[PDB]
Design a protein around this ligand. Structure first.
Ligand SMILES: [Cl-]
Ligand SMILES: [Cl-]
Ligand SMILES: [Mg+2]
Ligand SMILES: [Mg+2]
Ligand code: NA
Ligand code: NA
Lengths: 9, 236, 236, 9
């Protein structure tokens, strides 16, 4: 599964 | 600490150079030094911290999976005995990965989380805490597997509670948190239905709020939404 | 040495695991430990040694080029002053790269080359010696640039002399040596005509010997020949 | 320019 990119808002 | 003599601003500058050079171990060391100056991090600096350690642990996780697969094949019926080396080397990589996770968790506990009052900082850090416990859970097998899983769950849950109260449903931090907690449910906690439900509700509530966003914010949010969609496609 | 307590065969086994896991720093440490056992290396083991260190220095060279480019832009007219950090960090990466090159050169000098009597081992090691001096030359700027260049040239030349006497013109070691010495001429020694002449003669003499080869050997040789062709296309 | 692969004869 895909998880979030590190850089985020 | 080896970075104790370097200015905070110089550490941040060099972390950005290290990123450009794809020198993520250096990047992580610079950002650890910056955190250890004791001041809070800005949004950009939090992103740098996360990029650095996510790339370091990412290489370790990928290596660990390769080695674990070889080890499991060596333990099948008919596999020739090759000695302790596969286990030893998997253990070496595992111990280094656990060390990186413990380092990140240590920075979060001393003292990033306790100083983080705004939702955008506090949710980001609590999500990171869940993430690095999740990476520990991926390799855990002994008497502390259950406690590592519950530590990940607890950090994600506190982050979720804040994000739902304080951020719009399109906020990329809220989205990335929900995405990662859903991965936790599916891959760690043996809760695929919870994973699917969370991904779907998160996607749908974000869809309904896109109309409020600028073009650039719409792009940021839809990027994470697509990851939720990709997971739902894999899982259903 | 940290690998002094590990069996030679275990170091080789773990180097192969590290390769599969893309853990090239580990791979290089294992192979250094194997070399330091004091026995000669087999063909496969020489290839492992080279793969490991080529990948380590490859990442350093790529990072160095990124940082050197940023540094050169910072020194153009109109560029805002940003302090010593770009130079410092380029120097850090440069020093680590030089350390890796010195480590490889040290293994070759103590005592791989002096024990290597067959053409396939001796040419391989002398080519490596030229290569790692070439990598040192890529970053050299001071009073020792000329001596580093001449050390690379000398090692390549000894390797060339042996390879022309003892190996067929399609031998992949001979081909890879000629390819690399031609790159040396073009990129290090300011001798593009020599580079082009060497690449062309090497290609043509190999072409004429392909008829003697099995299908598998033909594939091995033509792969390197295509690199000579690619360079000739870039340079002409 | 292209240089040799590490693994070679
Ligand atoms: Cl090991
Ligand atoms: Cl530095
Ligand atoms: Mg058997
Ligand atoms: Mg100006
Ligand atoms: Na073994
Ligand atoms: Na500066």
């Amino acid at each position: 599964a895909h998880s979030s990119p590190a850089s985020x808002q | 600490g080896a970075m104790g003599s370097m200015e905070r601003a110089s550490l941040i500058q060099k972390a950005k150079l290290a990123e450009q050079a794809e020198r993520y171990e250096d990047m992580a060391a610079f950002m650890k030094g910056a955190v250890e100056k004791g001041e809070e991090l800005s949004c950009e600096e939090r992103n740098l911290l996360s990029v650095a350690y996510k790339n370091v642990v990412g290489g370790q996780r990928a290596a660990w999976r390769v080695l674990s697969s070889i080890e499991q094949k060596s333990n099948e019926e008919g596999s020739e005995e090759k000695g302790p080396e596969v286990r030893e080397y998997r253990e070496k990589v595992e111990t280094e990965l656990q060390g990186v996770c413990d380092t990140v968790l240590g920075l979060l506990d001393s003292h990033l989380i306790k100083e983080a009052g705004d939702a955008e900082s506090r949710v980001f850090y609590l999500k990171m805490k869940g993430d690095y416990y999740r990476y520990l859970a991926e390799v855990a097998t002994g008497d502390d597997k259950k406690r590592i899983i519950d530590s990940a769950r607890s950090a994600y849950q506190e982050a979720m509670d804040i994000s739902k109260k304080e951020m719009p449903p399109t906020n990329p931090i809220r989205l990335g948190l929900a995405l990662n907690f859903s991965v936790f449910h599916y891959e760690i906690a043996n809760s695929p239905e919870e994973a699917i439900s969370l991904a779907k509700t998160t996607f749908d509530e974000a869809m309904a709020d896109l109309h409020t966003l600028s073009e650039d914010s719409y792009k940021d949010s839809t990027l994470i939404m697509q990851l939720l969609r990709d997971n739902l496609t894999l899982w259903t």
